[PDB]
Design an enzyme around this catalytic site. Structure first.
Site, PDB file in Angstrom:
ATOM      1  N   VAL A 231      -8.797  -0.492 -15.247  1.00 47.28           N
ATOM      2  CA  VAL A 231      -9.807  -1.084 -16.095  1.00 47.28           C
ATOM      3  C   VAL A 231      -9.905  -0.281 -17.397  1.00 47.28           C
ATOM      4  CG1 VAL A 231     -12.251  -1.691 -16.305  1.00 47.28           C
ATOM      5  CG2 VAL A 231     -11.043  -2.021 -14.125  1.00 47.28           C
TER       6      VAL A 231
ATOM      7  N   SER B 217      -1.144   5.100 -15.117  1.00 49.01           N
ATOM      8  CA  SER B 217      -2.009   5.055 -16.319  1.00 49.01           C
ATOM      9  C   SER B 217      -2.760   3.735 -16.493  1.00 49.01           C
ATOM     10  CB  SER B 217      -1.213   5.344 -17.594  1.00 49.01           C
ATOM     11  OG  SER B 217      -0.816   6.704 -17.636  1.00 49.01           O
ATOM     12  N   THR B 218      -2.502   2.773 -15.623  1.00 45.97           N
ATOM     13  CA  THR B 218      -3.170   1.482 -15.742  1.00 45.97           C
ATOM     14  C   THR B 218      -4.514   1.461 -15.026  1.00 45.97           C
ATOM     15  OG1 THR B 218      -2.072   0.607 -13.785  1.00 45.97           O
ATOM     16  CG2 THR B 218      -0.991   0.255 -15.903  1.00 45.97           C
TER      17      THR B 218
ATOM     18  N   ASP C 262       0.860  -1.185   0.000  1.00 44.58           N
ATOM     19  CA  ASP C 262       0.000   0.000   0.000  1.00 44.58           C
ATOM     20  C   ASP C 262       0.899   1.239   0.000  1.00 44.58           C
ATOM     21  OD1 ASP C 262      -1.571   2.233   0.773  1.00 44.58           O
ATOM     22  OD2 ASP C 262      -3.046   0.940   1.737  1.00 44.58           O
ATOM     23  N   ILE C 263       0.913   1.963  -1.116  1.00 45.21           N
ATOM     24  CA  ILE C 263       1.861   3.047  -1.289  1.00 45.21           C
ATOM     25  C   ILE C 263       1.639   4.170  -0.286  1.00 45.21           C
ATOM     26  CG2 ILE C 263       0.506   4.302  -3.060  1.00 45.21           C
ATOM     27  CD1 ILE C 263       3.258   4.797  -4.503  1.00 45.21           C
TER      28      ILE C 263
ATOM     29  N   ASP D  28      -4.852   7.655  -6.343  1.00 43.24           N
ATOM     30  CA  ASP D  28      -5.087   9.080  -6.119  1.00 43.24           C
ATOM     31  C   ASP D  28      -6.052   9.288  -4.949  1.00 43.24           C
ATOM     32  OD1 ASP D  28      -4.939  11.913  -6.735  1.00 43.24           O
ATOM     33  OD2 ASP D  28      -6.680  11.723  -8.032  1.00 43.24           O
TER      34      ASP D  28
ATOM     35  N   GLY E 265      -8.877   5.045  -6.957  1.00 45.68           N
ATOM     36  CA  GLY E 265      -7.621   4.337  -7.046  1.00 45.68           C
ATOM     37  C   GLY E 265      -6.561   4.895  -6.120  1.00 45.68           C
TER      38      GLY E 265
END
Length: 196
Positions: A144, A141-142, A27-28, A51, A49
Site C-alpha cells: 500500500v 518493496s511493494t 505462501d512463500i 517479513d 507482510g
C-alpha cells in the site's frame, strides 16, 4: 496465512539456459526451495507482510539470529538497501532465508531502480556461489514500502532474466500471495520472453 483463502491458484514456468524461472500464486513461508527471500527492514526486526509471516513461521530463533548477524556481520548497523544477509530458515521447510532490504518508494528516486535490482542480483549471486540450487522471491518493496507493482515487477523480472541468461543457478521462483500481482507478473514475463 499470506494467501487469502479462496484465491485463484496459478503457475507459469519457463526455462532460461538450464535454469528455470517460475511464477506462482503461493505462501512463500511454505516454499520447499532451498532458499527463500525475506523482504526485510533495515533493522531486521520483524514487521508485517511477508517479513511478519516469515518470522511467525520460522519461529523466535530467527529474530535472535538476525539481531546477532546485525551485531556481528554489520557491526550493529542496519542492513543497507539492496544488500543481503543469509540465515537458517529454522522451522521453515526451506533451509535458508536471504534477507534483503528493498528501497522505500521515492526515498531515493535517483537510485531506487538500481537498488531494487541489487536485491535480486545479490541474492542470486549468493545462491550461485554457495550452489544453493533453488530460491523463491516474494514481491519486494511493494505494498500500500509502496513501489508501484508494474515498475517493481519489471525490475525484478528483467534482472532475474538477465542473470539466468548469464549464469547457472537452477530454479528461481517468484511467489506471490496476490492473484493481482501474479497476473501482472505472468503477462510481463510472457512479454519479456517474446523479446529474448
Amino acid at each position: 496465512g499470506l494467501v487469502p483463502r479462496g484465491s485463484h491458484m496459478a503457475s507459469m514456468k519457463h526455462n532460461i539456459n538450464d535454469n528455470t524461472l517460475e511464477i506462482v500464486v503461493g505462501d512463500i513461508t511454505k516454499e520447499t526451495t532451498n532458499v527463500i527471500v525475506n523482504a526485510a527492514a533495515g533493522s531486521l526486526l520483524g514487521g508485517g507482510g511477508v517479513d511478519g509471516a516469515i518470522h511467525h513461521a520460522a519461529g523466535p530463533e530467527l529474530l535472535k539470529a538476525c539481531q546477532e548477524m546485525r551485531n556481528n556481520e554489520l557491526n550493529g548497523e542496519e542492513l543497507p538497501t539492496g544488500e543481503v544477509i543469509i540465515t537458517s530458515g529454522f522451522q521453515l521447510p526451506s533451509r535458508f532465508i536471504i534477507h534483503t532490504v528493498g528501497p522505500i518508494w521515492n526515498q531515493t528516486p535517483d537510485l531506487q531502480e538500481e537498488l531494487l535490482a541489487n536485491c535480486y542480483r545479490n541474492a542470486l549471486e549468493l545462491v550461485k556461489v554457495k550452489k544453493l540450487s533453488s530460491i523463491s522471491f516474494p514481491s519486494i518493496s511493494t505494498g500500500v514500502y509502496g513501489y508501484p507493482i508494474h515498475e517493481a515487477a519489471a525490475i525484478a523480472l528483467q534482472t532475474i532474466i538477465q542473470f539466468l541468461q548469464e549464469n547457472d543457478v537452477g530454479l528461481v521462483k517468484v511467489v506471490l500471495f496476490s492473484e493481482r500481482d501474479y497476473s501482472i507478473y505472468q503477462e510481463k514475463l510472457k512479454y519479456l520472453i517474446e523479446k529474448i
